[PDB]
Each structure stands twice: as C-alpha cells, then as structure tokens.
From a paper:
pmcDEC205 (CD205 or Ly75) is an endocytic receptor highly expressed on the dendritic cells with antigen-presenting function and has been widely used as a receptor target in immune therapies. DEC205 belongs to the mannose receptor family, which also includes mannose receptor (MR), PLA2R, Endo180 (8), and FcRY. MR family members are type I transmembrane proteins with a large extracellular portion, a transmembrane helix, and a short cytoplasmic region. Their ectodomains contain an N-terminal cysteine-rich domain (CysR), a fibronectin type II domain (FnII), and eight (ten for DEC205) C-type lectin-like domains (CTLDs). The functional studies of DEC205 show that it can act as a receptor for dead cells and may recognize dead cells through cellular keratins in a pH-dependent manner, as acidification usually occurs during the event of apoptosis, but the mechanism of the interaction between DEC205 and keratins remains unclear.
To investigate the structure of the CysR∼CTLD3 (residues M1- S627) fragment, we expressed the fragment in insect cells and the purified protein was applied for crystallization screening. X-ray diffraction data were collected and showed two crystal forms, one in space group C2 and the other in space group P1. The structures of the CysR∼CTLD3 fragment show a C-shaped conformation in both crystal forms and they are quite similar with the r.m.s. deviation of Cα atoms of 0.89 Å. In P1 crystals, a homodimer of the fragment forms in one asymmetric unit, where the dimeric interface is contributed by the interactions of CysR∼CTLD1 and CTLD3. The CysR∼CTLD2 region of DEC205 has an L-shaped conformation that is also found in the crystal structures of MR and Endo180 and the C-shaped conformation of the CysR∼CTLD3 fragment of DEC205 is similar to that of MR at acidic condition. Notably, the structure of the CLTD3 of DEC205 is different from the conventional CTLD fold with two unique loop regions (loop 1 and loop 2). Loop 1 (residue E521-C528) replaces a conserved α-helix in the conventional CTLDs, and loop 2 (residue T573-A592) becomes much longer and partially missing in the crystal structure. In addition, previous reports have shown that oligomerization could be a common feature for the MR family members which may correlate with ligand recognition. Recent cryoEM data also suggest that DEC205 may form dimers or tetramers, which might be relevant to CpG binding. Similarly, the dimerization or oligomerization of DEC205 may also promote the binding of keratins.
Residue numbers in the entry:
A (entry chain B), B (entry chain A): 32 to 89, 92 to 187, 189 to 269, 271 to 346, 357 to 414, 416 to 490, 500 to 573, 580 to 627
Write the structure that this text describes.
Amino acid sequence: ANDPFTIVHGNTGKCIKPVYGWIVADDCDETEDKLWKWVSQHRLFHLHSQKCLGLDITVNELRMFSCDSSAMLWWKCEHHSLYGAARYRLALKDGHGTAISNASDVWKKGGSEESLCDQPYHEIYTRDGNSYGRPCEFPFLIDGTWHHDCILDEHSGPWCATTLNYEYDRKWGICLKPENGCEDNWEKNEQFGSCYQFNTQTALSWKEAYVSCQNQGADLLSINSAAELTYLKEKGIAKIFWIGLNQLYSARGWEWSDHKPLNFLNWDPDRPSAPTIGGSSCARMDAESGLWQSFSCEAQLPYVCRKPLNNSDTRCDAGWLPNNGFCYLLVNESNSWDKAHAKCKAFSSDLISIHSLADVEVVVTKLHNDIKEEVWIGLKNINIPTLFQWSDGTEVTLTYWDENEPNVPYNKTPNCVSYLGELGQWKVQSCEEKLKYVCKRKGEMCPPDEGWKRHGETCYKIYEDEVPFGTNCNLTITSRFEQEYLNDLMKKYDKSLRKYFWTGLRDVDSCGEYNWATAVTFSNWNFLEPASPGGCVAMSTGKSVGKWEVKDCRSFKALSICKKMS
Amino acid sequence: ANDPFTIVHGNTGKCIKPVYGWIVADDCDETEDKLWKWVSQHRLFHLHSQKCLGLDITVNELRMFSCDSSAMLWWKCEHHSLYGAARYRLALKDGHGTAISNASDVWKKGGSEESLCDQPYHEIYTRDGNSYGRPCEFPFLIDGTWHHDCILDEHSGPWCATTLNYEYDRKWGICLKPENGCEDNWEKNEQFGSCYQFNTQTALSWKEAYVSCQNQGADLLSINSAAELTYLKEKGIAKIFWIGLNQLYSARGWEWSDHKPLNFLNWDPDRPSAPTIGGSSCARMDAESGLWQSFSCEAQLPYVCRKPLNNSDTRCDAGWLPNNGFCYLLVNESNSWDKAHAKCKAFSSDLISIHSLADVEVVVTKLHNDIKEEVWIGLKNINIPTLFQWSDGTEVTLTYWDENEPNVPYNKTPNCVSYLGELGQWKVQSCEEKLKYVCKRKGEMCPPDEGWKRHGETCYKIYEDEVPFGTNCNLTITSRFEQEYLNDLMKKYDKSLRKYFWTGLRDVDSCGEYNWATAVTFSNWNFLEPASPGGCVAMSTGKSVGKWEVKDCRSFKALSICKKMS
C-alpha cells in the first residue's frame, strides 16, 4: 500500500537493513537496499530482500523470514515505538537489530518525522478478470519473486493476485490505482464535467465500494439531475449497482457520500426512504427500472465511481428576528403551503430558504425555546422524478433530512417539506397540511486564510497534526447545534474513519467526573461510553459521527478543532 | 431476553427494588415487585416499575429513568460487581442504592450465585408480519405500557415490535420462541423424524439465522439424504434459503452446523466448493434448481431449520500396524483406487475407513512422518446426487474435509477421495490417479460416568463453570492433533462464541515468555497474538476456532478442559 520508506533510528540517525537476513544499521541513503514497505496482515516488507521482518519465539530471535512463514510477522506502532509479538519492541544494540521488552527506542520514517504506520494501509481493489473486484493481496509469490505491487505486462493493464496463494487458486484482477488523468479506467463526460467508472462484474459491500472510490481519489456515484438519471440506465454498466446514497455515515437522514445536496430523488416504492427491512441503510440503483432501492449495506454488488474534471448584524422591522443579511418572521396562523407561500408573497417576501446550519440554528433557537409542531419551508417538489427546489429560486446547497427522510411518496405530484424536532431537521409532507411557517426578507472578523471557517459568530479551525490531548487548545461543545456543525466539519474533512478529533472534555483525577479545561450542559456520549474514568474524550466520523468516545490521555493522539470569538 | 431475576446484595443478602423511583434494599420475598430483567443495549429493566435503572452524570445520581431517556442506562458486570458510566459501581449505603467508584460490593441473581451477566442476552427473531424476520426490540412502548416480552392478542400468535419506536414505524413480528411441541411454528415429518420450520418471508444473515434457531433449541437445516433434497425441492416455501453448510465456523473445509457428516452433496457448479467470490464461506439452497451455492455469509436470505422428534489393545500380523480392533497397512506402490481396492481385497481386507480423529492421528504419525503425497481412502461416490460411502459398508460418521473440499465436479460419475497435508485431511480426486494407499483388517476406567470422553488413550473433560485460570487445572496442548480434537470437543459443546476455554499457557512475570504450568513445541496463536505479555491464554469456538488469544489473568474467566490416563 503506497510509498515505500526507510526506518530511521531516533537515537543514532542510522537506517536499518538486512544483510544475510540479519538487521544492521547503515547510513540513511535512499538506495534500493533501505526501502521498507507495508504488506497485508501488518507485515513489514523489505523490498530488495523480498523478505518480511519477524520474531521467532518457538528465548527468541529477531530476523527476516520468508513472508509466508508461520513466525510472528506482525508489527504495530506504539507512540514512535514499534512492538510485535508479546509487545517485544524493535531496538538496536551496537548497530544490530534486536527485539526486547520495555525497550525505549525511537523509530521514524526517512525524510519526515511521522511514525512507520502513520499512513494507513490503503486497499487497492480490482476490476475485471476472475476475482470479481476483490482487493489486491500483497505480497504474492510468482515463481521465486514476491510481488508487493501491481505488475506491468502487455495482461490488459496492471494486475495483482487477489488471494494469499497464487501458486494455487490463480485468481487475479486489474489494479484500480488513483489517477490524475481520466482515461484507461475511467470514461469522460464533458456534458457533466465528471468522469465515471462502471465497475460492472465486481461484487463489493457499500463500505468496500466507498473505500474503493476513496482510494481512487473519487467518490461514490451521486445523481443530481434528471439528465443523469436517464443516463447510465442505457449502455452493460451492470444490472444493479451501488450509489452514494446512504443513511449510515450521516447524523440522521439520507445523504450523498460526497455530501452533494440530496434533492433529486427516485425512490423505488418497494424499498423506499423508510426501509422495508429494518436497518438496511444503504441505497442502490437498478439500471433497468431506474429506481433507487434501500438495501443492506453489507450486500456484495457492483458499483460506479465519479470524480470531477478539476478546472455583521442588520436591522429590520419590529417582531422580525435578524440573522446576517436576512430577517425571518414566524407565522403562527397555521395554513397550507399554498396559502402560506401566497400570504408571504403578500408580505413582499417568500417562504424561508435555508443554506447553512446557522440558518437552522437561528430558526430553532431565536423563534422558539413548539418543537413538536412542524413548520413550513420553501423547499418543494412538483416533478417526477423528484426534484426539490426552493420557493425563491435560490440554489439548493443544504438538505438537512431527518431519519428515513426524504420520504417522497409514489407518483404524488406535490411534495412540500417542513422542519420539526430539537434540531429543526426536515421531512417531506403532503402539501395540504396546515402548519406554522417562517418567511425571509432582506434587512440592513476572523484571521485570513488558511484553515479557518466561520460558523455564526465563531471562528473554527482544523489543526491537521495527529497530536496528543490538550495540545494546541481545548474545544468546548456548548450545544447540540454546535455539535452538529462540528459533525458537518469533520465529515467534510476526513474520509472516513482513521482520523479522530479532540474535544475538551477530560477527567483529571479518576473520580469519574469529566469537565472542560477552564458547565457540562450538553452531553453526546457514544454507545457504552465513558466506559472508564480518567480519560481524554475524542470523536470521529463514519457511523456514530461526532459521538464521544473515551481515549487514553497518555498514548492516544488525534487532530484538533478549535474556535475563537466565542 | 430470558428470565427475570432479583438482584441480591452480597454483603447483606437483601435484594434491591425501586420505590418512588429510588433504589432501596429489602427483604428478599421473591414477589413480582423486585423482579429485574435485561433489555437491549445492556439495560436493567424493572418489570413492575416498567423503568430502567440509570445514572445522571450532569454531579452524580443513581435512580430509575424512563427506558427511552438520554441518561446513562447501560450496565456491565465486572466479576460479580456491576459498573456503569465511567465504571461507577452499583453499591448500597445504609440500604439505599448509590453508584460509587472503587466500590467493593457484590451482586448476584436471586435464588442462585451466578453473576448478573452469566446468562447472555438471547435475541428473539420473528417470522411473518411486516418486519421480514428482524428480531424483537425490547422494550417497546404501547400506549403507556412498556412491553419487555412478546404479547398475545387476536395477532396470529405472540408478537413484538421490531424497532425502538412502535407508535411510529409500526413494525411488528410473530415471536419465534423455543418450543417443546412441534406445532404452531413447525411442520411435522414422520418420514424423517424431524420437524421443519420454513422461515420464508424472512431475510437474515447466516449467523443471525443460526442464532435464531440456536435460540429456538433447533439447528440450521442439514440435508443428509436424496429424499430430503427431493422433499425440500417440492413442498410454496422460499425459493432460496440458508442451510447449515458453512466453511466459516470450521477449522477448515465445509461442514454442517449440527456437525452431521457432510457426505451427501449437490454443489451448484456456478457457486461451488471453491467459492467464485473469494471469502464466500456460507452456502444456501435453491429449492427450485435444488443446487447448493456457496455465498456471502452476510447476505440477508430466508432460512429453514429442523429439530428431532426425540423418541483397547490388539495385535496383528507382521508389518501391519495396530489400532484397537483394527489394523492398518500402508502400500507404497502407487495405484488407481480400483486397483488398490482390488489388491486389498486380495489381502483379505479393504481400503481404510476412518471414524475418529484418533484414526487420522495414527494414519498420519504412525505410518509416516511424506505429507505432500496424497494417499487413497476408502470413501467413494458413484451417484450424481453425491453420496460418499465407505468401501467396507461402515457408516460415514467422520468427514474431515480440507479447505474448499469436498470439491465434487459436475456430472462426474466416479469421485474418489484421498488424504493430504500435515493433518491428513481429505480432498476429492479423480478416481484414475495413482496414489499410495492404506488398508484395514480386524485384529485381536475414566469413567464415562463423570463427563469424560476418551480420545485415543487419553480421557478429556469439560468443566462447565466459567472459572478463572488455573482454578480447576492447566491444560497442555502437545500436538496439532490434540488441538484438532480440542476443536471438535469445544465445537460439540458450545454454541457458538461467548464461551471461552482455558489453556495452560501463561506468562508469569512479564518477560514475554509463555509456558505451561507444571516445552512450547507447538503454537496455535490467533491473529495478532500474543497481543500483550504477562497474560493467561484462552481459546474459543466459531471463526478462529481453537486459536490462542491472550487474556487478563485477574479478571477474565473461561471454561476448563483437562486430560488424564495418557
């Protein structure tokens, strides 16, 4: 997976390499005798020796082995250290490699300071061939040579073995590596400005497909317009394939994996927004009927991939509450959407349009302290296939759907959404319902780039270095709306797991009391958390995005998010 | 779900109950007002209060909550103790319930001495209804009443809600509970002496199906004869359903979940013994075509399940090797199966039949030390509905298939198996091959009262109490054949995970050296094991059956296996 590296010793500055199978120190120069790689099952692979670093406990011995050996061949980094079987640490005595317990040695990659496993092992999934898209198995034996990477022939292109034994089995696939150009594996489309990849004879789970497109630099297929929906349904392009539409990795509701706005829809009524089989949270496209069906996120299906062709407060009238360049007025006289829209046209305005989470925050906290009551929103659909559009023509940037939303019914021509709940999230409604409504009309600093993004009257920033707790700063999460913005931010940053972020919640002492560094009004613990006292609290993305998990204050490191002007 | 219980305090002997929402000690009068239950997400549910025990951390408070509350409602047992959020332990001050750190209190179920988490939470899967077999979600709200178990209406039978919210969602299912009689959910069949249950409107993963019927007291369907195949092929049941044929929970090779002999086969050549999609380790039956297809163990498919209608030392001639009432002779003159069978009929004997793993051990270690050579076995098939049978009429009790075996080809009339490998495991062969062969002919205390099972010349025993390491005895695993027998024993005992067993391998001190309690010649570590030094080594069943994992010597408990008379 990805670049080879050299293993520099911290205390000496020498690079380790095997001679006759035994580890020795050497001058750190980038010749082919010092390059190390990561191969599957957490194995360290010396490229030139074609052998893998391992221990023999059957006291013990540290040397190179044939990479398919039964010896202990796995290695994990523990805070610059590198331990193996029974946490024996890789160390260097008199310039000779030896593994011993409690060793206080330091190792780091050559040319940087990051640990050996700082870069995660990236799977390289295949297409075509006989392997049905199963990922590359590194390394694999071909008549004497251990291959850690794809092979060039002309086999149609770069190819790899997909099982731990190529002498038997004989299963292989064409390597899908990240590209800059949009050919070989991709197909250009000037009409949409995005390259598509139709993995048709493959069979991957939705998470596996999303990882396959992540590692290719692309994203899972999102369909934003009717022109795209009518497309693909022609052409083999697979009979049924995955699409980025998922409920798994969002905080409630459905979304596109690339966080494009979810406003063009085409639910199969048999497998709709509210899934028939409970807990099936990942949708697929049927290239025959054209419909999108909710489905079990673990089913093995073909998949499509796409990537782009990269080229102050105000004042209003009395009663109207202000927010940035706009002002909102809530109407308690419950009315249909047509009557509310017309009545707000009479107020020389229109039904509210929402584009940021700040808009939701103000239209939940500045207007109320109802909550249970649904409130009308300008967003509406009139066409089949579904296309939600704002009443005031503004572009659809935000779609803040609740769980199992948007639940657009079959063939019903008018579909009119509203907001409910503590978070003000949206759900589709029959347009004749009589609800309250909110209407918008016009009214009347952080440091420069880079990395700062302003939410409301607070400036947020992502510190991108996997650093221990309390370094840089301590973020305080005051409300669930702040939590939601943090969720959107983390989601927009990292893909998908692998990267945690730091809260400011910490238990000094061990009494079991978690507090910020100077009132714990808001709490967002994950499943079975805290689970232990005296910890430092972190959060991540993916499923349970933003949920608080406890971490070791000593060893665990994560990224930082921090705010000013608060 | 399972039985309600009372929570007796260790130091006093009193069992706790809520009054006005606050926990107090009381005289254990086994009345319905002190009965506690387990509900999902590790929640403790008081039956009469219909509320769940919980903590408030926003300083510290222990009381009852509505089970849908956002408060900390989960509880985990730590060696008779019971901790919650941040490991605050349930305790009793002056007979009043309070959660405090480092509390040295003890709790036990009422009427016994087992801990609160000694009994595992059993899912109750459903059939019919609109939920497609998804399990019961306990508890569920119906107009004021929180229901922790299935309820009787006329609903056709017992029914439950399958989501966390039944007033919304409106998803329900028919309770599939363990039965004594063979009606209501089942269908009798005198021809086979086994009741069948065809879950057709369901969609479950292989593991969820196996657990569903495990919880039902039955086992996944195994087809042992052509009559059963022809029966299932006819029958208005599911077109495709799961069957117990799996390669996941075995040490290697395919087997039946009920450990029935795998000798009747019907592989679909499209999805055969050697899976098309690598990693597909769970097979299914097509009741239309009647073929068995290897498939992804995570696919949601219907499933069928069946339960029964319950109604040492010899000597031979020179050269021949002795084993109980039988004797084996290996022939090095490579020959076809027919030529070897005829030649051994000329020696007034027959091609070897194998019935125990001890037979495999002697025919691997007593006759040879090589290994790479395949050796003929008496087992053979002649039918197109595949049925392997011994040449000497002996009953096929053992089927010791290698990985991706039995690889029965399509329409091929003669199928003749052989043994290969270090473990002497079997694989199917074209019958014309010229191999060595082994032939058998006749020849010339523990007690079984106490749970002991004789393997070779050694008696083994499974102690049924989840006890800490070394309490009973320290088991030494000498050879891979002993490990294999242990796999058979554990598999026949426990279903499926959840129950660990104790080895004798242990690291006293923390140098990282694991040894038995009185030579580490044989080692069977699991993936990324040993993960830490100074541990006590246990093993389990399921996937990675018998593989050694390191565990805490203080807190971890497991079962015992121990041997005598060797």
